[PDB]
Design a protein around this ligand. Structure first.
Ligand SMILES: Cc1ccc(NS(=O)(=O)c2cccc3ccccc23)c(O)c1CC(=O)NCc1ccc(C(=N)N)cc1
Ligand code: NA
Lengths: 276, 10
């Protein structure tokens, strides 16, 4: 399809200010404000009752939104949302304003949580789909991201290769942003990921972030959960979602890394649900 | 501190 080609960038052959950083590597705390239309697949999961941000998410077609399972279901914290508890807001930039004539607000038809999502232990298979009640109209600000094929995943999911994380979550581990935030972060070697934590890491996870000695900073944080870790393919110039913001111990701590759901590894399940 | 969204969105 037309996935992963942004109306305000690839479609008009304009580059955003940091995408070159990603390309140069293919050999939110400490982020920046997103540019307008920089992440047109970004979705905000929005609670109705206390009207508040619940999580990030992504648009993968006109009717399907991808997020982290723990955004919807986490029994240890008495979290178990139903379809009616929330809305998805699409095309947003500002965190708090209603963006008249730009954002579109959709209701959920059905939530699907991965049947082997491990909320009991380590958040293994931290992935969920939301089918919308009505298709959303694409615009300059609303456009789906691609899901990776095996070859794009193998070629790009390499240590040192950078992807990009976006969200409206905390700027610090212990303020909130006026607009959507963005940070580019390098994928980390699996042994370094494993050695940074006591949590049992699985093949359905990867980690990203700079090492203490590399100097540069940045991480996702509370409120960024469920949002996309994306990479711009140097083969076809399309953006692909490789990860979902899952977990981390604090935010932007030296020696710690952000963990992300490995989208490709779970793609058979995604397709199973969408095929219905 | 979220702006009220249109009531039509339930
Ligand atoms: C559901 C959940 C439960 C616990 C944690 N906290 S945790 O990451 O230390 C963690 C992960 C896996 C299993 C755990 C079991 C026992 C205690 C903690 C655990 C967690 O982070 C989340 C998910 C969450 O809250 N994510 C928000 C978040 C997003 C990104 C980051 C980051 N990249 N720094 C940090 C946090
Ligand atoms: Na870190």
């Amino acid at each position: 399809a037309d996935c992963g080609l942004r109306p305000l960038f690839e479609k008009k052959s304009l580059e955003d200010k940091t995408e070159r950083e990603l390309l140069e590597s293919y050999i939110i705390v400490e982020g920046s404000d997103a540019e307008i239309g920089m992440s047109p697949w970004q979705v905000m999961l929005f609670r109705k009752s206390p009207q508040e941000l619940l999580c990030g998410a992504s648009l993968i077609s006109d009717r399907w939104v991808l997020t982290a399972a723990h955004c919807l279901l986490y029994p240890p914290w008495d979290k178990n949302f139903t379809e009616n508890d929330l809305l998805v807001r699409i095309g947003k930039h500002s965190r708090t304003r209603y963006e008249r004539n730009i954002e579109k607000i959709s209701m959920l038809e059905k939530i699907y949580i991965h049947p082997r999502y491990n909320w009991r232990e380590n958040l293994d298979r931290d992935i969920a789909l939301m089918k919308l009640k009505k298709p959303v109209a694409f615009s300059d600000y609303i456009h789906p991201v691609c899901l990776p094929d095996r070859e794009t995943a193998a070629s790009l999911l390499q240590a040192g290769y950078k992807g990009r994380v976006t969200g409206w979550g905390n700027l610090k581990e212990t303020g909130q942003p006026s607009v959507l935030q963005v940070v580019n972060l390098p994928i980390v070697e699996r042994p370094v990921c494993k050695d940074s934590t006591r949590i049992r890491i699985t093949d359905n996870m990867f980690c990203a972030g700079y090492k203490p000695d590399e100097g540069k900073r940045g991480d996702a944080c509370e409120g960024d959960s469920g949002g996309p870790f994306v990479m711009k393919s140097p083969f076809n110039n399309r953006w692909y979602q490789m990860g979902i913001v899952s977990w981390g111990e604090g935010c932007d701590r030296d020696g710690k890394y952000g963990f992300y759901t490995h989208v490709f590894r779970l793609k058979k399940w995604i397709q199973k649900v969408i095929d219905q | 501190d979220f702006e009220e969204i249109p009531e039509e969105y339930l």
